[PDB]
Structures are given as structure tokens and as C-alpha cells.
Design a binder for this molecule. Sequence first.
Ligand SMILES: CC1=CC(=O)CC(C)(C)[C@@]1(O)/C=C/C(C)=C\C(=O)O
Length: 193
Amino acid sequence: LSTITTHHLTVPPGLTPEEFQELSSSIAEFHSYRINPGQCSSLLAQRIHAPVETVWTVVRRFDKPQTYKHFIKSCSVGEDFRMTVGSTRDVTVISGLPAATSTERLDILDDDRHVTGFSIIGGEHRLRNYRSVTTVHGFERDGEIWTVVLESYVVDVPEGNTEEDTRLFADTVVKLNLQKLASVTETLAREAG
Ligand SMILES: CC1=CC(=O)CC(C)(C)[C@@]1(O)/C=C/C(C)=C\C(=O)O
């Protein structure tokens, strides 16, 4: 039947076992899902050499995903947009012709614990029931500071497609965007001001 995910029981690539052991409780709390046989799920991680709040400032900007995501032609939130749970954005994604479109709902926004997440609720694409959660975590060792970003998703595997291809597609999109997040925020952190 329906199973529970095991992301919180395995070390994701781009993370040390030591980092994982510090995060296992957060991964269980924020990055676990009950999924059905038609579904798949994944957890991705990205180490960033920047302070938490520098990374969180970018991560939390629901109305501006283009700041850290690839292939975003536009993101409209209308007027008068306030950042509250339930608010939506219309993203236009230029990774093909015609451009894919996605209407996405802000599911979570916790500025204290640095948790956010969204659900895809419309548009033209093949990621039915896509939902993701992103958490941001600070690390310290001998006065040195860095950040780990964790991002997990659940999504329906579209008819005609394998779970492997579905996971490869979504994993690559999320991974490459976490890479852009790392570049953008490390640049911010490096230049300060
Ligand atoms: C890049 C792109 C191609 C598609 O066909 C679907 C969709 C338009 C939703 C998407 O924006 C996918 C976005 C994903 C998986 C994650 C995200 O944005 O956090």
C-alpha cells in the first residue's frame, strides 16, 4: 500500500555523514512523506559557504524564484502581493517551446525555522501533484560558518513514464537550481555590503 519515505534514514549526495547526523531530526520532521504506489520522492542537499540568513533571504522570496532558478522567463504574483501561505505565483519556464507554465501555491513560510515549500496547482507540465519543501540550516565548526540547504519533493509519476526518468528529471532541475542558489548566495556573502 502507501509507504513512508526514508530520506531521513539515508545520506543524500553532497552531504557528509557528520552533517546528516546533525540534520536527521529536521529531515524526519520536514522531509518525510506518506506516498502511494503512483508516486515518487527525493531529497537533495547543497552545501553553501554563506551564513544562513544570506541564503534564507533568497530562498524565502516566493515572488522571485528566478533569482536562484534556471529557465524562468517570468514570475507573476499580481497585486497587491503579500507573502502569506496560500498566495500563488504563475511561473513561465523557457526550457522548451512553447514555454512550460506552472501555477504554484506557497504552502509554508517559517522565517524562524527557515522552512518554506510550495505545491504546483495548475499550468502545462507533467509534474502532477508536485510538492516540495526547502529547509535552511546553519553549521559551525571552530568558528567557521556554512549553510546546508535541503530540498525534497513528492510527485506523481506521469503515465507513460518510469519512476527513474521522473526522478532524474526532477532531481536534475532541483540540483541545478540548488547550484545556482549556492553561486548567487556565495557571491552575495563574498561581496557583503
Ligand atoms: C523547470 C520546470 C520544467 C517543467 O516541465 C515543469 C515545471 C514548469 C513545473 C518546472 O518549473 C519544474 C520545476 C521543479 C521540478 C522544481 C522547482 O521549480 O522548484
